[PDB]
Amino acid sequence: AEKAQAIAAARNTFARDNPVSAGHHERARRPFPLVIAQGTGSRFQDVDGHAYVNFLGEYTAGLFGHSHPVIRAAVERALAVGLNLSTQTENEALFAEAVCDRFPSIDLVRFTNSGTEANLMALATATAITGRKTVLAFDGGYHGGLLNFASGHAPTNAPYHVVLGVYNDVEGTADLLKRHGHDCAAILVEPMLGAGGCVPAERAFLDLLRAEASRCGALLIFDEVMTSRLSGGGAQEMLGISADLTTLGKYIGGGMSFGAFGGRRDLMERFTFNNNILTMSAGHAALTQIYTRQAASDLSASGDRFRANLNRIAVENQAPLQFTGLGSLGTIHFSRAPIRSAGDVRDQQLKELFFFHMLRKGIYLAPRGMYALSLEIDAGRDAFAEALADFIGEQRALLMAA
Amino acid sequence: AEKAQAIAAARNTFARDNPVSAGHHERARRSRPFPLVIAQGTGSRFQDVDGHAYVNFLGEYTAGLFGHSHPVIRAAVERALAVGLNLSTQTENEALFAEAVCDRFPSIDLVRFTNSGTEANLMALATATAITGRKTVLAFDGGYHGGLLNFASGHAPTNAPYHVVLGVYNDVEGTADLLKRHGHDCAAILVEPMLGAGGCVPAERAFLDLLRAEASRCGALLIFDEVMTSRLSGGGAQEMLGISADLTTLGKYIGGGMSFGAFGGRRDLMEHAGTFNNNILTMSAGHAALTQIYTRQAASDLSASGDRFRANLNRIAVENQAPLQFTGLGSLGTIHFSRAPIRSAGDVRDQQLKELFFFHMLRKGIYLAPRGMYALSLEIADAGRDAFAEALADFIGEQRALLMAA
């Protein structure tokens, strides 16, 4: 088939293009992944020396870019004053007060080494306060290595009695609550399905989740590891919803291993916690001196207009691919059907073709097609739109019809 | 009481000594005397927020093995920083790092990196339950495997909902009975070669070999958590004892002092689907530290220094006829108010003596955990050992009438 032949030609060209990534894949021991050597601003250089504009943004973790001066200088100063300090430094409280300033909902904060640990600690506190064991999750959600529900479950997930609902469907959730209301300790939900395909949550869906959690005595945990960037106080500030607990992710720690969980005092008074000097310093400098509300607003508005530009590339060529998401985070889907839950993403060869083609054009993003803008990426948007335009113009006959 | 009045006087002097740590505690209260707040560090020394310099004997609970300012590690972090933060999920550093770790622990046929030892032990347990299909996990009272993997109280309401079965440390008879009862359901036996939080209680070697025997006989895996004990040799206590675990978990110093953990072992057991750690600074710092600084010669010298030094401190106790003891292995030890031989947590059966000692040695410029833990770093030298031994000598001489009798 022309689709198979074209993806084979592009994949052979990719493999012949990047022998050093192949050698590293061999030494570390489905085409090999790209192995990146260096980075600067919105640019990434692989081990073969090819420069790319990094649209993937490290799955929203690299919001500040690879070489921001304020963060680099903060990390250098923290390094020079000493590594592996004791369990008590000023940096932790300064950082916690900055976060609470941004998320006043988080009456008490605790730091972890990852968002996975943050969600685990939140679930632990939920089960401890309520004494209940069942946790309500949603198909396609990803809260960590042992908190994955893309398959509806994972055999590696921690042995919580997880209840699985379909995203953006409050009828099924109300029925599941009728069934397990007494046993529901927590409702863990992302304001946008990150791994599920950047499926935005309908606002009524989240408001009704809050209502139901209140009425059945379960807590509401918002996994804002990804969506916390949607405003200075995240999507929860955007919608006026107050969860019992909130979890935040790695970019809050300046690009290094960090997570945070917190909220109600009575619930969180139960509280190894993360205070690494470099992480505290980088996250603090980044939040207080770089991540201004105006900078985040510019970034998310640019992301919105830029997703519009892409979808209009699709619309003009009558090709039914779409970018879905919110603000500066989107992801390409081979179907043009409106996506409400995981069941709606119901062909990876077109996505692979797109990924390889934009790589050949110098555009870097996830093979699943997710893009997360960083502060450094109008010229980058123009180049990205022109690259997508040229690729779709050339490969138009291989894509579905709108 | 003379002890109560002396500890009250020492605590009042501590509070008057460190107003800045108190101010930091107050400001942190927005989100048992107050803890010391540390400002900077250099080598084996720490300077607090009030400007006092201390010899750092606690070594950050075994994590600060390299010291606070080691040059090659600093340069590795600087170079990685300049080449760029937040690189993609695939870089060369992770494989170089994994090969060095596998060199040190060739038992770890497949390795995976995590952001913490808590995450490493959790992922190891996940792999155990997945391969075996069983739900019960055998742990030991007093063990600490992470924030949600803590068993000092015999359990915690925060622990992940594994069906953990708890035995008493260094007791294979009770373990054999519990294994006879739950053998078919035991997915893993998770054990530290030394009770870290339990009070640096070394595991009897026959106890670990018999845990291996039972794991083999009933089909459970054996997870050795060497987050703390991995420093006892180039291949950890498992290399020291000739034990081959089904899984091994390693801790933060392998990642150069930053958030890092590792778990690995058998191929068939081992392995989006899971977030793995490839942080640029962590990979670079841990790699440079292991390959250029954490040599077997340096680690051997350090553990020998720890052995002779525990002898020196315990002999301060013996000469002064005081029943306090330092227990542990190599360069890791801990003070206990009793002189009774410690085999399990139940043998630690008064915290005011430890608090008095801690505050007095602080006044003398020696820093360690209020619980009394010491973990020497590569920077602490014979002079540091001499100063610590003389400090303990003077403190026990002055506070002689307040301590128990041997």
Short mmCIF file of C-alpha atoms in Angstrom, two decimals, chain A residues 14 18 20-25 30-36 46-48 355-356 359 364 367, chain B residues 88-91:
data_model
loop_
_atom_site.label_atom_id
_atom_site.label_comp_id
_atom_site.label_asym_id
_atom_site.label_seq_id
_atom_site.Cartn_x
_atom_site.Cartn_y
_atom_site.Cartn_z
CA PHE A 14 14.96 8.24 9.63
CA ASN A 18 20.31 9.04 12.84
CA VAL A 20 24.11 7.69 16.63
CA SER A 21 20.68 7.30 18.25
CA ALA A 22 20.68 3.73 16.92
CA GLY A 23 24.11 3.10 18.43
CA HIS A 24 22.96 4.43 21.79
CA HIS A 25 19.84 2.25 21.61
CA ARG A 30 8.99 0.22 16.20
CA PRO A 31 11.95 2.32 15.10
CA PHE A 32 14.51 3.43 17.65
CA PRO A 33 13.77 6.58 19.67
CA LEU A 34 15.65 9.80 19.07
CA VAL A 35 18.45 10.33 21.59
CA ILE A 36 19.00 14.01 22.40
CA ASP A 46 20.04 14.94 19.02
CA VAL A 47 23.17 12.81 19.22
CA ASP A 48 23.63 13.14 15.44
CA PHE A 355 5.86 12.61 13.27
CA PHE A 356 8.61 11.46 10.90
CA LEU A 359 11.15 15.50 12.17
CA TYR A 364 10.17 17.73 17.37
CA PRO A 367 5.27 10.21 18.48
CA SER B 88 13.99 14.32 26.04
CA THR B 89 13.18 10.90 27.49
CA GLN B 90 16.27 9.41 25.76
CA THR B 91 19.89 10.44 26.41
#
